[PDB]
Amino acid sequence: CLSGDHFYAHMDKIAAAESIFGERVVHGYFVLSAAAGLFVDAGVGPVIANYGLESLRFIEPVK
Amino acid sequence: QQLASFLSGTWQSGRGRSRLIHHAISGEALWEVTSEGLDMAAARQFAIEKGAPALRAMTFIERAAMLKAVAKHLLSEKERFYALSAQTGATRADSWVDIEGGIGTLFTYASLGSRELPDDTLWPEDELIPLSKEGGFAARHLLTSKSGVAVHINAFNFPCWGMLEKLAPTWLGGMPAIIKPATATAQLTQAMVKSIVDSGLVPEGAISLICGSAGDLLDHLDSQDVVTFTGSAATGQMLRVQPNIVAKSIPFTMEADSLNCCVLGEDVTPDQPEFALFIREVVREMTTKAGQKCTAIRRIIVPQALVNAVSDALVARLQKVVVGDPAQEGVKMGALVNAEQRADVQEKVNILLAAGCEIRLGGQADLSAAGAFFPPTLLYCPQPDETPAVHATEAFGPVATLMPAQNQRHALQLACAGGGSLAGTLVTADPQIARQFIADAARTHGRIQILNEESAKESTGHGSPLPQLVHGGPGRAGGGEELGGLRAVKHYMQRTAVQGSPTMLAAISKQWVRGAKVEEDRIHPFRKYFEELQPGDSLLTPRRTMTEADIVNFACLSGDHFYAHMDKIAAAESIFGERVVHGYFVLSAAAGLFVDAGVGPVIANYGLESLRFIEPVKPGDTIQVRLTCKRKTLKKQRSAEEKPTGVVEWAVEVFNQHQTPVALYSILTLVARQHGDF
Amino acid sequence: CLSGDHFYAHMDKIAAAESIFGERVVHGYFVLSAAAGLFVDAGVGPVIANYGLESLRFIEPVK
Amino acid sequence: CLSGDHFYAHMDKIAAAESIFGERVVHGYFVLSAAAGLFVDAGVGPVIANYGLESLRFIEPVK
């Protein structure tokens, strides 16, 4: 809803059943976003800006 | 028995002064090699005008599939390769390296050509080099395959591997090869070449063979040719001063003989497991392939307090090594390839004994035996700094001298005193000692294995050069480099920096780059199949106004309450001036804009190549995304049940109402093909 | 986000300024949904089901 | 939550089990809103304004 990515492997029970994943899976960018929600310190510190991401490969699906 | 030479598409043999191949373990002559009277100019001519346009007409994906097909066809009939390699005096475990390492090199170059090489005749290795402020003038480096032949002059060590580790970068690079094996073991090389040719997989002219001297090959080479050498230094340094090679300026790559080291550190005490794996590594590397490999350990550097322990444990481990016939059981080491090589090893031992010492069976070697047997030899040098013959002379067999060191400062100097080596080893459990060893000893070694207890379990060892690691070394080791992953296929290409407008570079490279012309054709690009996509098929998505509620909902949902997004005070004290939109929410809302919701050829995403956030995105700051196709690169559909597909790359360009490029990046995406091939 | 209706008169600041509304407005279906949030009792009562809406007209935009 | 319609046939497990639907069902106005999220173009086009709805009948429940 928030991102607007209504892809059929995430938002469709029928089409994801006939896909390679078998059922509808978590978005890869939400795995990225919740990862950054896990490791980023909320407080003010030496970390200034992010601006970068080197090599992203989604290996196995998250359900 | 006639041992022919595949030249000009036909199997031919010379007529002249013929050398002859002796059987290694017994001694009789059962092959003869000659190439006199064979027209080498017609061979190079047939190769250049028959197999070079056939290889260059293929794409890199098709050439990688050709390498995989040749690997499967040569792995199927692999037992005749062992039958022909048993004549070289090697055992089953010694010929296993020679056959299966070359076939795995073919599979590895097939995998590297399938994963990181384009579906094009050409290969752009750069992304883009901007050379203008407006953007209408840019450049990038191409890599076009050369229009000549590759002359591979191999050593007698690995016929199968040493031909076949050079043949995969040559074919994958895009050139036809002319292989000149060493005339001591060319029968296995002709078995390999015949198994390649009698399969219908490679084009005609793409591979040649000369069992014998080249004679007039080097005098006819064009400037688009390369020569790769492996063997003695005295031959390759005379083939470097050949007048056509220096006149036409063709790349001569040489791999000479090296003095490989195995340095023992001060931290290793004999109660540790490091000592036993050190001794096992030295013994296995000295006895594998009878010490006739180019990466064999020939200088053991130990501390002064550990001279007696190493020099007794090596004897207690190497007296178990049985040197005999490979077919009879209980025989570890095989034999050398020839009696001439046995005489060469014995005269190099007699040179090393002019200033060294003796620990074991050394110069005692029966020259009258029916077989090229040489015992495992462990030498000793009490004054390594005052003996240049240790650091200038290699005995190319089971010979490896031992010499002490003084507290990791003399050990680095003795490891670097080899004049530039091909391989090296430090056995420690201290990472700072390994850091100090690489800080000085990597200048002379092209490969260094740091062996400890964790590494020694699943290691490939020290005498199996990996097909994706650089098999080279400076100075005495030759100077050239081989097997460096995709570095080896760049020795067979020309690197041309192509300049122009980006809309011209996109049609040259067959890849949309940064500022080329677009092709918007009223339907969504994710609805297109693979064959109807083109690099440059763009999409101008609708807009989305970023607000404070977007920042709040993404910081809540992701759980990323970073102070430049969720604090009004600290963001005013920061570089941004106020709190900004998350970069990952710019990424997520971008993907919300360009990804079509319906079921189409897009299978999965699984990829994101290079994300950079340039300018910050604020509340009240709109976002518009320019999705455009960049790179197609189909996959070969390895089975028949699998769906045909291709890894299509999309360059994503987000921008605001000021049209400045915030968050430009690139995604990979699997797109199913309409029509398959296999 | 929730409905998935990213219409340009609701989610675009630029195109809503170039349109008849002048600025981006509230969705009419959200006016309907928040209306039903206001007048519907949460408790169990005589109301069985809804199933019906007779004649909906949006006259003036909600900002 | 967003609309505020906490009707017992959508938000209660006990009362919707004893109702005519058998369990708690999806809101009809959310079926309407997700429908409009499915068929409406996000971009600027010939469609200017919506302002209307002719005859809404919810026939079978959505679960």
Short mmCIF file of C-alpha atoms in Angstrom, two decimals, chain B residues 543-545 547 550 620 622 657, chain C residues 1 6 11-15 24:
data_model
loop_
_atom_site.label_atom_id
_atom_site.label_comp_id
_atom_site.label_asym_id
_atom_site.label_seq_id
_atom_site.Cartn_x
_atom_site.Cartn_y
_atom_site.Cartn_z
CA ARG B 543 4.32 11.69 -10.27
CA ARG B 544 4.03 11.33 -6.50
CA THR B 545 4.24 14.24 -4.08
CA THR B 547 4.99 14.74 2.18
CA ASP B 550 5.04 9.68 3.74
CA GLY B 620 6.31 18.95 -0.78
CA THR B 622 7.38 15.65 -6.17
CA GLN B 657 10.03 19.02 -10.11
CA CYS C 1 -1.94 4.11 -0.33
CA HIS C 6 -2.82 7.27 -6.90
CA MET C 11 -1.13 12.51 -5.22
CA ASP C 12 0.51 15.07 -7.55
CA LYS C 13 1.16 18.64 -6.44
CA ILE C 14 2.10 19.77 -9.96
CA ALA C 15 -0.74 18.33 -12.04
CA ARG C 24 -4.85 18.20 -4.64
#
